[PDB]
From a paper:
Components of phycobilisomes in Gracilaria chilensis are Phycobiliproteins (PBPs): Phycoerythrin (PE), and Phycocyanin (PC) in the rods, Allophycocyanin (APC) is found in the core, and linker proteins (L) present along the whole system. PBPs are chromophorylated proteins that share a general architecture. They are organized as heterodimers (αβ), which assembly themselves into trimers or hexamers. The subunits of PBPs are mono or multi chromophorylated with linear tetrapyrrols covalently bound to cysteine residues.
The pure protein was characterized by its spectroscopic properties of absorption (λAmax = 651nm) and emission (λEmax = 660nm) and the relationship A651/A280 as purity index. The purified APC was shown to contain only α and β subunits by mass spectrometry experiments. The trimer for APC was obtained by crystallographic symmetry (P321). The biological unit is a trimer of heterodimers as it was determined by size exclusion chromatography. Indeed, α and β subunits contained one phycocyanobilin bound to cysteine 81 and are stabilized by Asn71, Arg83 and Asp84 in α subunit, and by methyl-Asn71 (Asm71) and Asp84 in β subunit.
Author numbering:
A (entry chain A), D (entry chain A), E (entry chain A): 2 to 53, 55 to 143, 145 to 161
B (entry chain B), C (entry chain B), F (entry chain B): 1 to 110, 112 to 161
The structure:
């Protein structure tokens, strides 16, 4: 959240919120309604976003093939479940104003996780990216915000 | 460190659910009180000094507390006391702008046993912070003054 | 930090005695299990990753523990959990090669109150380390697998 | 002990024993039998080793003379008792593979000890050295190991 | 106190009092009687010292005028009370041999105090200075010691 | 950290009073014992080594305490023990010169639970410090020897 982030940045220097940071928070609260709108639009079409998955596989068939991390319908399914997770994280981030909830919930130490699991990270990046192509298709340029959210996800993954 | 928004989020994360109409409602409310919070934080930020002044002279000065045998009697204990009130006010402004008191439980409260073990009285401290509540209130308003009220009171319940 | 040999020594130092036939016997035994310990430590060192994998998927994955409301549900808590199992395994290899579990009581155990105070469950941890016992065992053998067994179990008794 | 030493050296870097350190430990365990043999040979002839003391005194008569730290038969005796201590430490070290037990038991802060007591440290060094001449006489070149053990003692003392 | 100060300075280096520091303490104890004499002379004439206040006001009428920190007879009185405080601190210091009691009791964080209160610090410095003109008038050159005590006060204030 | 003089001062500060005839009297007394304290501190400073020697050989050497199974048996525990006695003596000289035992309660005492938790026995320690009392006494005199006596005893009461 932009609010918690400026709070921690200020407290780190034992100071009050500067008028600039306050103005930023004002722009945020004034963007609240459009923000929630985007959030609920994404939530509504989440199953479509994650399913259309298909683009990832079509672009990275290795992950679902023998030897790949998502070989089989059960592992494929689990991989779809992760994409759902990250999309939800994207909706949180949208509502919050920054990437705090995404980082806290599913980027601090992801590389460790998937390294243990044997999941190719670039594959995840491609899945969430495709999720941003579909998602961007669901939104009419509003698309920016969610855009940089996804982008921060597939960037932060690797 | 969470707040109204992040509190709603985390409320919608441990259950593994997307934000439902309720989350959107609470978020709506905070978005409705945001401008108020921002302004109040600006005003307090501008007048922190005068507020701690009016609080100290309000509940502390010209009593035993400040005289020999007193807990803020020497100049070093005076600076420590007004420093504590400055902290309390700044984190009250924090929590106020945020919308949730966890930051207090996380970065100022986790203090009662310390004050007990070093002799710092809690009564005059409660009365002091409350004085900050009345000063801040009368200087900002009834809405912003009650919103600070909930957090100041929170600190009172934490010390007591 | 002692081991079989140094444990025998210290057993022969606080009494102020030179090493008697008994000390020579115990030392003999350890010298007889040495090559085994060395090899097992090599094999575990080579396959630590795959072992922690087989342990996690063995006792942890696809349950509540990993889902929302879970203790290893977020990615940061997942990395912390697999990091704990990595530590446990590495000190199990240590103690194994050494021949005495004191290193565990000295550099990993002195943790139960911490897990309790931070919410880390002990049950799934016991089941996890035990899973490491079965994986390591089946991958190294019955002798080396039981010798790791005694130390893994030791950690279980330390946490529980 | 070589075993505890490589353990602590490795753990200091949060790593497993390297194949080289493991091989070293292998050479140690394979030297176990000869090692114990030397240990029990020294233990058997310990009284001889410490008594033949005499060489020290003959080389450092000042310590036993008036004004010296070991003036009198009681102080002489106590000084013989210290030599016994250090020889025992040497047998521990022999069995262990390094100087850990000797350091831990009777070199960490010895200079402080003897400084309080008023004992000349070089005198101790000479006593344990003589103990290595006799000891070396009891062993047929096997003599190396115990050799560097004693040497590490009289070196570490000062 | 000179005694506590040399103690802490020595302990800071884990050492005994040096013969020089000891000699200093000797000069102090030998000055004890004259010291106490000065202390009781000041204490006796304290009300005179603080009252003759008047010199401060005459030199800094702004502090007692409208807008000034000591406007009114009640605030004037309180300001006289502070001068009494600092004079007492001066007597403590005199008895002690250094500025420890003055620092500990009423200089650590004074600027913070008076900044909150809105008191001009230079005004305090002038009050205690005048207190040193009167005080110096009460003592016949003995005047040195108390002199540097006051001076350390009005210096340390700002 | 206070002493006779600063103790009198603080006794005259928390009440907000100038020094009265009583303060002047106590200060007088300390000023009367000052030269004694200074000299004694010089003599102890000159002979600290020999004093710790005579204390150790006095109560410690040639018993279990120093033999295997003993708390000062190894050379590292011997250096730690004589280091403790050196500290105790130096702070005894401090408090002695000062005239008040608070420095002990502030920089050496706040130790019993530590010794208990690490096995350091208190009995042989009390006997050791007392030995320092008798040695220091016989080497400085009856007056300076009793003035050290009060502080050595103070430490004994702190450990016990
Ligand atoms: C899909 C695009 C890629 C892929 C994924 C894959 N994931 C897993 C298993 C797990 N993934 C997680 C992920 C998360 N946990 C979290 O808390 C968060 C943040 C909210 C994330 C992203 C977890 C915990 C598991 C394991 C247990 C469980 O899910 O409940 C697998 C399973 C592999 C296996 O052998 O078990 C796969 C296959 N696979 C690909 O190839 C794609 C690149
Ligand atoms: C002999 C070669 C030299 C010498 C020695 C000497 N030693 C002492 C007294 C003590 N020595 C020790 C030594 C040890 N304690 C340990 O734990 C270890 C490691 C295992 C060692 C080496 C101790 C504790 C004492 C004092 C009490 C006791 O022994 O029980 C003395 C006594 C001196 C005296 O006045 O008491 C002497 C004379 N003296 C020489 O001149 C030689 C160079
Ligand atoms: C007088 C020369 C100047 C001045 C002074 C002034 N002081 C105050 C109020 C207080 N001053 C203190 C001071 C001390 N407390 C200590 O413990 C010590 C060390 C021993 C000192 C010096 C304190 C505690 C107070 C407030 C409460 C109380 O005194 O009990 C005031 C009051 C201002 C007001 O509005 O209340 C004034 C006016 N004023 C000047 O202009 C001079 C330069
Ligand atoms: C935000 C996080 C945070 C808070 C709030 C905090 C409080 C705090 N107050 C302290 C002391 C103190 N606090 C006071 C406070 C008071 N005296 C009075 O008479 C008044 C009634 C009252 C204040 C309203 C005083 C006098 C001391 C000094 C006690 C001493 O050490 O001498 C100390 C001991 C350290 C020191 O100041 O020397 C802490 C740590 N610390 C923190 O990290
Ligand atoms: C070798 C010496 C040593 C050990 C062993 C050790 C353990 C240890 N585990 C911790 C936390 C943790 N430990 C776990 C562990 C688990 N979660 C699960 O669901 C699993 C069942 C289980 C592991 C098998 C988790 C999730 C946390 C993080 C709790 C939190 O801070 O959020 C923490 C708190 C610090 C942190 O990680 O943030 C320590 C200090 N520390 C040490 O110094
Ligand atoms: C001045 C402030 C101060 C004091 C006094 C102090 C004492 C103190 N003594 C200690 C240990 C010890 N203290 C002794 C003392 C004794 N053994 C005996 O047999 C004697 C009877 C007795 C001394 C007369 C010993 C053997 C240890 C070491 C225990 C161990 O760690 O192995 C330790 C643990 C740290 C260490 O030395 O390794 C402290 C911290 N620490 C301080 O900061
Ligand atoms: Cl922060
Ligand atoms: Cl960021
Ligand atoms: Cl929903
Ligand atoms: Cl303080
Ligand atoms: Cl602080
Ligand atoms: Cl034997
Ligand atoms: Cl963490
Ligand atoms: Cl850690
Ligand atoms: Cl280590
Ligand atoms: Cl070494
Ligand atoms: Cl200090
Ligand atoms: Cl100074
Ligand atoms: Cl009086
Ligand atoms: Cl130690
Ligand atoms: Cl220490
Ligand atoms: Na600060
Ligand atoms: Na700024
Ligand atoms: Na589709
Ligand atoms: Na598939
Ligand atoms: Na990759
Ligand atoms: Na949270
Ligand atoms: Na879920
Ligand atoms: Na619902
Ligand atoms: Na809700
Ligand atoms: Na709900
Ligand atoms: Na608003
Ligand atoms: Na404003
Ligand atoms: Na009043
Ligand atoms: Na609110
Ligand atoms: Na504390
Ligand atoms: Na209470
Ligand atoms: Na030991
Ligand atoms: Na013995
Ligand atoms: Na036997
Ligand atoms: Na045995
Ligand atoms: Na035996
Ligand atoms: Na073997
Ligand atoms: Na291998
Ligand atoms: Na399952
Ligand atoms: Na074994
Ligand atoms: Na902890
Ligand atoms: Na339990
Ligand atoms: Na690490
Ligand atoms: Na290597
Ligand atoms: Na002989
Ligand atoms: Na002799
Ligand atoms: Na020497
Ligand atoms: Na030291
Ligand atoms: Na000097
Ligand atoms: Na006058
Ligand atoms: Na006036
Ligand atoms: Na000024
Ligand atoms: Na005090
Ligand atoms: Na007063
Ligand atoms: Na009186
Ligand atoms: Na008195
Ligand atoms: Na009185
Ligand atoms: Na005297
Ligand atoms: Na002298
Ligand atoms: Na005896
Ligand atoms: Na006295
Ligand atoms: Na401790
Ligand atoms: Na007891």
């Amino acid at each position: 959240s932009i609010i918690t982030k400026s709070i921690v940045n200020a407290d780190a220097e034992a100071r009050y919120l500067s008028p600039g940071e306050l103005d930023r928070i004002k722009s945020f609260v004034l963007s609240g309604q459009r923000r929630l709108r985007i959030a609920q639009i994404l939530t509504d079409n989440r199953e479509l976003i994650v399913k259309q998955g298909q683009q990832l596989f079509q672009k990275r068939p290795d992950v679902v093939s023998p030897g790949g991390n998502a070989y089989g319908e059960e592992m494929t399914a689990t991989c779809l479940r992760d994409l759902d997770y990250y999309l939800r994280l994207v909706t949180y981030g949208i509502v919050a104003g920054d990437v705090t909830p995404i980082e806290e919930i599913g980027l601090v130490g992801v590389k460790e996780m998937y390294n243990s699991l044997g999941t190719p990270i670039s594959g995840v990046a491609e899945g969430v990216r495709s999720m941003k192509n579909v998602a961007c298709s669901l939104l009419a340029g509003d698309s920016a915000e969610a855009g940089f959210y996804f982008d921060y996800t597939l960037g932060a993954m690797q | 460190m969470q707040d109204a928004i992040t509190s709603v989020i985390n409320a919608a994360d441990v259950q593994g659910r997307y934000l439902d109409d309720n989350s959107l409602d609470k978020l709506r409310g905070y978005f409705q009180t945001g401008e108020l919070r921002v302004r109040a934080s600006a005003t307090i930020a501008a007048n922190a000094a005068t507020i701690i002044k009016d609080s100290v002279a309000k509940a502390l000065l010209y009593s035993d507390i400040t005289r020999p045998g007193g807990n803020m009697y020497t100049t070093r204990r005076y600076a420590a006391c007004i420093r504590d009130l400055d902290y309390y006010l700044r984190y009250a402004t924090y929590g106020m702008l945020a919308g949730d008191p966890s930051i207090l439980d996380e970065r100022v409260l986790n203090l009662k046993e310390t004050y007990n073990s070093l002799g710092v009285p809690i009564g005059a401290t409660i009365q002091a912070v409350q004085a900050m509540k009345e000063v801040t209130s009368s200087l900002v308003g009834p809405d912003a003054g009650k919103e600070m009220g909930v957090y100041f009171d929170y600190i009172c319940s934490g010390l007591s």
